[PDB]
Design a protein around this ligand. Sequence first.
Ligand code: SF4
Ligand code: SF4
Ligand code: FCO
Ligand code: FCO
Ligand code: SF3
Ligand code: SF3
Ligand code: F3S
Ligand code: F3S
Ligand SMILES: [Cl-]
Ligand SMILES: [Cl-]
Ligand SMILES: [Li+]
Ligand SMILES: [Mg+2]
Ligand SMILES: [Mg+2]
Ligand code: NI
Ligand code: NI
Lengths: 264, 264, 581, 581
Amino acid sequence: KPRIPVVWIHGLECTCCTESFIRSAHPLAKDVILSLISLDYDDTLMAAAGTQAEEVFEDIITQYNGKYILAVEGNPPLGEQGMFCISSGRPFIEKLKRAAAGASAIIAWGTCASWGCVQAARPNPTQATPIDKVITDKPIIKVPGCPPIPDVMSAIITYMVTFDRLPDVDRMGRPLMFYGQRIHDKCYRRAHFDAGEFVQSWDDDAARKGYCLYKMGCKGPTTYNACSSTRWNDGVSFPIQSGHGCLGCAENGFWDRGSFYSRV
Amino acid sequence: KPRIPVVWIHGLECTCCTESFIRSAHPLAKDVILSLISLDYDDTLMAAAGTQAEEVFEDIITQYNGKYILAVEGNPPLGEQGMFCISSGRPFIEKLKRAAAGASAIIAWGTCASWGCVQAARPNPTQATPIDKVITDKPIIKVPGCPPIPDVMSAIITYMVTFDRLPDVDRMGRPLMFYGQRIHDKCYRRAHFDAGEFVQSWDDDAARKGYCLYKMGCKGPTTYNACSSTRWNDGVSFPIQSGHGCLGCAENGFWDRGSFYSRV
Amino acid sequence: STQYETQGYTINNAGRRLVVDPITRIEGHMRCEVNINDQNVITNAVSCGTMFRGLEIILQGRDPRDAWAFVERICGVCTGVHALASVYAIEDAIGIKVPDNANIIRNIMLATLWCHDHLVHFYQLAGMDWIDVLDALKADPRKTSELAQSLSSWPKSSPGYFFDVQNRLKKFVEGGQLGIFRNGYWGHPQYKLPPEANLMGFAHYLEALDFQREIVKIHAVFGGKNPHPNWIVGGMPCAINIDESGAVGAVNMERLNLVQSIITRTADFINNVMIPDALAIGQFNKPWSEIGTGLSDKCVLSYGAFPDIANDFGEKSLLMPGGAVINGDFNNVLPVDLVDPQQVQEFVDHAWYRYPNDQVGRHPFDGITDPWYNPGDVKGSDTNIQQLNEQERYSWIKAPRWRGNAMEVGPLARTLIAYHKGDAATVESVDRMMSALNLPLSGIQSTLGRILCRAHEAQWAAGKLQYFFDKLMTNLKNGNLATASTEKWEPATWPTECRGVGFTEAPRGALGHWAAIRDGKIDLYQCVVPTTWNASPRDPKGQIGAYEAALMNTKMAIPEQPLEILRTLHSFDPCLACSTH
Amino acid sequence: STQYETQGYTINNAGRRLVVDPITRIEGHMRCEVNINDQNVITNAVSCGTMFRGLEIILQGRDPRDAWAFVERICGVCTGVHALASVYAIEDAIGIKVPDNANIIRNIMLATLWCHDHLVHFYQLAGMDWIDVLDALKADPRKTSELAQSLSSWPKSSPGYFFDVQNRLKKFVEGGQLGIFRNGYWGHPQYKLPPEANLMGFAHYLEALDFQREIVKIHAVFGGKNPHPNWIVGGMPCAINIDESGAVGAVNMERLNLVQSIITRTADFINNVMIPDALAIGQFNKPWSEIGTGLSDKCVLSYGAFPDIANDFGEKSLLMPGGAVINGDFNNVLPVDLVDPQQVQEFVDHAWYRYPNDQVGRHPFDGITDPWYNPGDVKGSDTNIQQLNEQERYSWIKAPRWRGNAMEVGPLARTLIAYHKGDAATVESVDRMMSALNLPLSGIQSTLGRILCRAHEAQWAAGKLQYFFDKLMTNLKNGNLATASTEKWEPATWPTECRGVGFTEAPRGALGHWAAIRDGKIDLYQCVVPTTWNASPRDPKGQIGAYEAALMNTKMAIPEQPLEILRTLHSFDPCLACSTH
Ligand code: SF4
Ligand code: SF4
Ligand code: FCO
Ligand code: FCO
Ligand code: SF3
Ligand code: SF3
Ligand code: F3S
Ligand code: F3S
Ligand SMILES: [Cl-]
Ligand SMILES: [Cl-]
Ligand SMILES: [Li+]
Ligand SMILES: [Mg+2]
Ligand SMILES: [Mg+2]
Ligand code: NI
Ligand code: NI
């Protein structure tokens, strides 16, 4: 049977979300691409470049108008008439708007597309702006994190394909399945938090016993994601497990909430 | 470069510890056997049977007297003159004593060898007795659990090989590395325990959100093991993560501490 | 010496007596003795379980909800199957119906176990009876690659790979530390594979040792851990949440994705590694289609398994058929009833237990487990068995019979029952398999056939994993998430007195747990386990069990090297902890 | 039009203009334009970075301890390298010395990223320039097996495997949804592999896509996650505990065992899949040893990397050598000093930035990032560019020079530096590779050579992973566990005003971060990244950068199909987010 058309575009970004996707352990990204979806446009992976890539973009969005899912990584800059991010000689925002117009739904991968991420941190030189402030007439599913967890990305994809519907979302557009609870409410170091057992300086005796990272700046108490449950990279670790507090990377504005090493 | 000789004997047991060992993800059990140790006797895996297996046993313990490690799974029964567990026509305890006498050190794998496990639960029909109550003149490292975690077993093995020494142990003979902390002090549901957020009956709304299992009988608060941090089967899960409270299976006498569904 | 006739055999204990103790490459503790005649043919065989723990005794007084956890520890090899039989038994006693997803997940647990346990048996337990590991050192890597490629599409076949495996083996053995290969039977004339086949098989032994660890990740997802996953009376504890807040705390889409990935890999390994290896054993060892028949052309038994309709244990629901054949009459597959006191009974006249009358058999609801170590004259002492006395008590294993008949259970039994009930898939598969080997159907009733059937079943189970997974996903798509029934969780809701039976087909054969509940506690808990059937001692009629029968009449090339005994015993996949419990 | 001479090239923008925008199978956003004469030969090349974010501006006023986390988000492809440069820079400024284990773990992080990044580039980014995927459909599976087995010991080579891969591809394209293969350059005359080699390569593309996910588990252990692991100023946050209570909360023996397992697997994949495939590309595309030389026979630069003596960034410590060559004089490898204002400078006369004097270069401690979008007299308009005006400002990428010279950085540059400094391992590897190809040493200075060097370096880094792991374990055996120095963690311990340089060799080449701290805050933070060098625009002398030089003089078979342009650009592994930051 034909597979669902997917167009994946890239604004201002670091490409971490694309890298995260290809880390998926189950299903393998290979199997997602070969068997689950039709990944019809993606600047990182596609053979065609230049005019041949432009032809792909135009053919797909025309032939599959109203039927494709638009995945977006990164964001549009409003500064310099949009020419902080140029595609085919024109502002990226024009590509975003054209792609969004024909989409049935939009997945905003990562904190860049969802909220702004690093380029939007003070003083936001380029006036980088999240997708949902530009596209206001399409469903947008926010999948935040810098990047989101690989197997969260693939689980969201499989859910949508298997169940033929968008995931249910919270009031900010995040899938409830993975973003309904805080890091701190599923953190394996919570016993230490509750007992007042804290790392006070790096590599102290507390750190060598896996005590809580709150006093080292962990932002788990205010961050919604699946890192403490699903974990990263085939479940091998997550930030806190390897000794660093959560930075807050799934939350809007996390770069500008003070130092990562200042409490709460 | 010769490999350290290891003799693995089996008393009254269910063979879960041997099965757990072969589940090791890193190093693979294959690589342990081929490259890290010389597994010179093991009734579950060895080619030789009967008289040929008796010859292997005798040859190894004689040639390598004072130099081999004895691994023990299971335990000796004192009832019926020891003939609740018979090897080569004679009580298992005789084989245990002969193997122990030549060993440099003993690894008591599992709750059976360490404490007694299910056969020692009331009313202990066979008078099953842990290793350290019979062998009283040898180093014995207890690695409890029913069975212990696969990658804990292989980590203990590689520690001993790499570092050329026994692990440091607690007052009960358990390796501090994996048995120094309780399940409950590294449990990812502890936030829920702290908040009074409990499963009250199976498959209730709390269960579907991963709330704490204390009211369902979880024995994590009194159990020392690595299940909530190292986890099981390449880190995939552990009892609590999959919705059942800890049974207490690493602790002496856990079968007779009341119902698994009655609270600590 | 004496002689008597039973079941078409002449049991004669004249002649040289051979002892094999310990039996290795099994689970638990077994002793076997035989007598051989002047032609080195077995004329008597004695199966002895050399361990006992007493779970039936330990279970008395326990809360029925806890029973599964205790009885799971009957055995870590067939891990999970006793928990399943337990929750079935307690649910049958109390009157509990579980939700569909729970039943589907339990079927997944069982099918996972079949895949795992059959795979590991083939390679780690039985394989060295058929593959001469040391002879692999003489193989040509390029001819090994050619052989492998002729048998399978499996990718891992390069000459360089086989050379690398061979070199690893060479370096392992060169310092004299042969480990598990020490003092083996290498070079025995019954090793018939060419060197290239030995190298291919050894490579696959190693691949299977690595891969088996992955299969049980399915158990870790739904059951927390393997070995010894968790279960509940009323369903399973692995609550599901796909699309709601807090799915991070439950079986969610990521967890299900992991399960699917394992299913696919498991099927691929079984179909492209184990299946062609089993068929190759058959091709090079055709004479073993005529050795070790035993009871498999006389009396075979299956309870049936894998209820596809939740809480329905009848013929229209069980995907693995039940039935019994006796007297060699495969044209009349008989129904089995586990409550009927005239059907399953256990005798102890040749076992280390006390009954008030040892000349009668007891159905498990009337069962008694009163251990009594009483070996009689064993040509040594009570603590030095030189020769078991098979005229009196000689084992820790009870002797189960079905309508007074000695039965074989396990993969071959099941295959025969399904074939003769006219299961179309089974008929087609078995006929095609025997055709490929250019053997008659009767060649399946043999030691070789047991191995072929086991491999068949691993393939079947891997297919059923996908079926069950898809059924679970269908329910989830329809919004049916339930995994537990708790209406009767509380003891105040139970009958004051009730009893029930839980049954299934474990990897090794027909399993039953019989439980009686009174006043909220276990009053009686009796288990009859597949190896109890197969490894059974004799009964008051002198009838022999499946292992003793399969060993009868067997030629030994070299009496002191019991390779032929090992081959036939291992073909049943003995689990002695299970047998004795 | 105009014509001028520089660096032995005649830069002539008469004639037909070709535009490639977007460049795909890179990281980030690039535009390339060329002019090509009547003979289809490139006479002008223009490299344009089409994105900017402004990390250097965003970093002002931040706490130096936080800087690594911000600058890591320069790029998710070479993830970790900017964090490493950052902690180095801040430690250099403040005067912090990390413990040996922290340094060893950092070296493991960097080597793990070399292995991952180089592998994925070879297959997922550059591979389809060399492998004709659709031509793989015409291969004979048996001949594909034979080819693979002739080249490698890698196990996965059966005819049935290659058939299965081919059939997956056949199915994929059967519904007309070609996905990433749609509208590719398949059948172009520059595709020279035979069908069997295309099928082998495509199979390996899929195997690499799967396997690469495993490599980064090393980052997950020590750094929490990948992409974007965590670091600290003062060492690493992954405290170690091997033999004490609470090891479950730390890097313990089980975590280290996981790391070791990944190292072994990574080496095996690189050595038995990537290396033979790189050599096979070379065998079939020898003419590309003479195409794309660019600056590689003129000017090459390495800062050096992998300090083996903790906190010592000198020549006796760095395992990957540093040095510069100019004027084609490989007999004179010159030392690099990142503080010397006469060495590294960046120009902006052809870039979208403001300087007080755009005719001079600024060392990074004097750097200025004042964005100014001013494309001037384009064909089209400022928001609708048909042709950049390369006589004016044409890129978001600054133009770095070394002593005023335009340099190539990256794997080929490093290989040349190490070779000509006499690094024995590099000399042996290069000599063996070029002997296998029957090509002169000069054949490495080319587009093909960039690819060959990248594969060499993946192998080099995989070997160094083991070396570093063993060093860590040696320390742990000696009771040396420390992973962080905290005596200068608090801002009050820092100098009121200080500056530092952090440098390394990222996968794509020489990376530096220059930081000035004043009053506890970042006062200046300037980055010069490898793709900034390679993708540089022109300078006041008109000197061209590495990409523009490597494209010069290239023949195109089909002007409308930019395969030769893509081959050469992709051979540098462009990272445009890095280049612009
Ligand atoms: S480490 Fe962070 S998320 Fe975990 S308990 Fe402490 S503050 Fe909460
Ligand atoms: S689930 Fe058990 S171990 Fe975890 S917090 Fe609750 S009581 Fe403690
Ligand atoms: N299979 C299995 Fe174990 C036995 N016999 C059980 O039940
Ligand atoms: N490698 C890499 Fe990224 C670039 N260019 C950095 O630094
Ligand atoms: Fe995956 S592009 Fe990486 S920076 Fe934070 S989400 Fe953005
Ligand atoms: Fe691994 S033999 Fe299994 S019962 Fe509890 S530890 Fe014992
Ligand atoms: S920093 Fe990000 S990756 Fe998870 S642990 Fe915190 S949300
Ligand atoms: S039951 Fe045992 S396996 Fe771990 S979670 Fe509890 S100690
Ligand atoms: Cl943000
Ligand atoms: Cl106990
Ligand atoms: Li029922
Ligand atoms: Mg019984
Ligand atoms: Mg810069
Ligand atoms: Ni068993
Ligand atoms: Ni980059």
